[PDB]
Amino acid sequence: VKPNYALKFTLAGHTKAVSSVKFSPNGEWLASSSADKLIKIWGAYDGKFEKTISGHKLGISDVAWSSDSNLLVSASDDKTLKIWDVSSGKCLKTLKGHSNYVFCCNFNPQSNLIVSGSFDESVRIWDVKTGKCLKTLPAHSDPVSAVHFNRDGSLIVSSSYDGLCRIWDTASGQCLKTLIDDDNPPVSFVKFSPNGKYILAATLDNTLKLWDYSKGKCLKTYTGHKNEKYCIFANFSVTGGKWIVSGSEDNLVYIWNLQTKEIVQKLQGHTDVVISTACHPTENIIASAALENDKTIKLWKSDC
Ligand SMILES: Clc1ccc(OCCCNc2ncc[nH]2)c(Cl)c1
C-alpha cells in the first residue's frame, strides 16, 4: 500500500543543471541531458557512468529514447534537435526548423517519427530517417512545455504556458481536442497514461491532474508538492504499486497513490529543485535529477 524507495546511487558528472533523465526501454541504461550541453549515459542498475555524447551548441532541455533503445533524440536551446546513434555516439541528423529554444521531444512507439515542442509556440513532427520536418502545428499561443505520443502513435498531446492541453491527430495534424478546466494556469507538463485513456497534466499552481480526455473531464488531483516555476516531469509508476511520481521545487521526489491521491512517500536527498524523474520499465527503480545548485542524478529502489 506504500512503497519504500531508498537511495542506492548518486550519479555525478554534469557541470550544470540536469534537465531530463530517461530509462532506455530495454531497462539497461539511463540517459541524461543538461544545461552543460551534454548527454550522458549511465548503467540503470549500477549507476555506473558509461559515456558522454556531445554536439549541441547550447544547453539541452530534453532527451528521449527510440523504442529499440538504439537511438536518442535531444532538444536544445540552439533551436535544433539531434538524433544520436547511442553506441557510436554519432549525430545522425540535426533537425532544423524551430525559430527558438526546443523544449521537449519524443519518439512515437514505431520510432519512425519524432515530435517536438518549442518556445516558438509550435509543435513539429519529424521523419527520423530523412531528418525533415513533416508537419508544423500552430499548437499554442505560448511556449510548448511538453509533447507525447499515445500508445499506438495515432495521437499527440501537447501542453503550454497558455494554459491549454491539446490532442492532435498524428496523421492529419488536426487538433482533435482542447482541454479547459475551471481555470487555466500555465501547463508545465503533460503525457498519456500507458493505456492511452488518460492524460496527466502539471500546472504551475502546485497541482497535478489526471484527465479522461475522450470525455474531457478531470478525474484525479494530486497536491502537496511545490511547482510554480519549473516544467517538472511526472510519471506513471506501474512496475509495483500504481503510483504517480513527480519532482518538486522543495527538493523532494513526491510519490502519490494514484487512486486515493494520498502522498505515500517523499524522497529526501537532493539539494535543489528536482526537475525530472523517470520510472524503470520493469524494476521498482526511480531516477531523479536536480537543478544548478545540486547537479546530481539519484537512483532509488523500492521492494514494492
Ligand atoms: Cl533554470 C532552468 C530552467 C529549465 C531547465 O530545464 C528545462 C525544464 C526541464 N525540461 C523539460 N520539462 C518538460 C519537457 N522538457 C533547467 Cl536544466 C534549468
What does each C-alpha distance from 56 to 38, 64, 87, 206 come to in angstroms? 7, 15, 18, 32
What does each C-alpha distance from 31 to 6, 57, 101, 205, 284 come to in angstroms? 21, 19, 21, 29, 18
- Quick one: DSSP state of residue 186? P
CA of 72 to the centre of ligand 1 (A): 18
- Which is the closest atom of ligand 1 to the Cα of 33? 17
C-alpha cell at 127: 521523419
Domain that holds residue 13: 1-304
Ligand 1 residue neighbourhood (C-beta within 6 Å): 17, 19-20, 35, 61-62, 103-104, 145-146, 189, 230-231, 233, 275, 291
- Mutation to probe ligand 1, out of 61, 116, 203 (largest number of atoms < 8 A from CB): 61
Task: Provide the greatest CA pair distance for the chain.
Answer: 49
C-alpha cell at 257: 497513490
Residue 260's CB is within 10 A of a number of other CB atoms, namely: 10
- Which is the closest atom of ligand 1 to the Cα of 35? 17
CA of 21 to the centre of ligand 1 (A): 11
CA of 62 to the centre of ligand 1 (A): 7
- Which is the closest atom of ligand 1 to the Cα of 232? 12
* Minimum CA distance residue for ligand 1 atom 7: 61
Nearest CA-CA partner of 230 in 77, 13, 20: 20
Region of 216 please: left (phi>0), alpha (psi -120 to 50) or beta.
left
DSSP letters for 146-181: EEEE-TTSSEEEEEETTS-EEEEETTT--EEEEE--
- What residues contact 254, with CB distance under 8 A and at least 6 apart? 222, 224, 225, 245, 246, 247, 248, 263, 265, 266
C-alpha cell at 162: 497558455
Task: Give me the phi and psi of 6, to 5 degrees please.
Answer: -135, 150
Q: Cα–Cα distance between 99 and 266 in angstroms, integer?
A: 39
- Which is the closest atom of ligand 1 to the Cα of 18? 17
23 SS3 class: strand
CA of 65 to the centre of ligand 1 (A): 18
Strand order through the sheet with 49-53: 18-23, 29-34, 39-43, 49-53
Q: Cα–Cα distance between 38 and 76 in angstroms, integer?
A: 10
On whether the CB atoms of residues 68 and 92 are closer than 8 A, the answer is no
CA of 61 to the centre of ligand 1 (A): 5
What does each C-alpha distance from 297 to 3, 19, 21, 245, 270 come to in angstroms? 20, 10, 8, 16, 9
CA of 1 to the centre of ligand 1 (A): 32
Nearest CA-CA partner of 192 in 246, 230, 235, 241: 235
CA of 211 to the centre of ligand 1 (A): 23
Q: Cα–Cα distance between 36 and 63 in angstroms, integer?
A: 14
Nearest CA-CA partner of 39 in 21, 24, 26: 21
Q: Specify the number of domains making up the chain.
A: 1
The domain spanning residue 282 has which CATH number? 2.130.10.10
CA 271 centroid distance within chain:
21
Q: Cα–Cα distance between 80 and 177 in angstroms, integer?
A: 28
- What residues contact 155, with CB distance under 8 A and at least 6 apart? 149, 167, 168, 169, 170, 176, 192, 196
- What residues contact 141, with CB distance under 8 A and at least 6 apart? 121, 160, 162
Q: Cα–Cα distance between 244 and 234 in angstroms, integer?
A: 7
97 SS3 class: coil
Name the structure determination technique: X-ray
Q: Cα–Cα distance between 152 and 137 in angstroms, integer?
A: 20
Nearest CA-CA partner of 96 in 48, 130, 141, 62: 130
Bridge partners of 300, per DSSP, are 7, 286
* Minimum CA distance residue for ligand 1 atom 17: 19
C-alpha cell at 275: 526537475
Bridge partners of 298, per DSSP, are 10, 288
Q: Cα–Cα distance between 126 and 178 in angstroms, integer?
A: 23
- What residues contact 88, with CB distance under 8 A and at least 6 apart? none
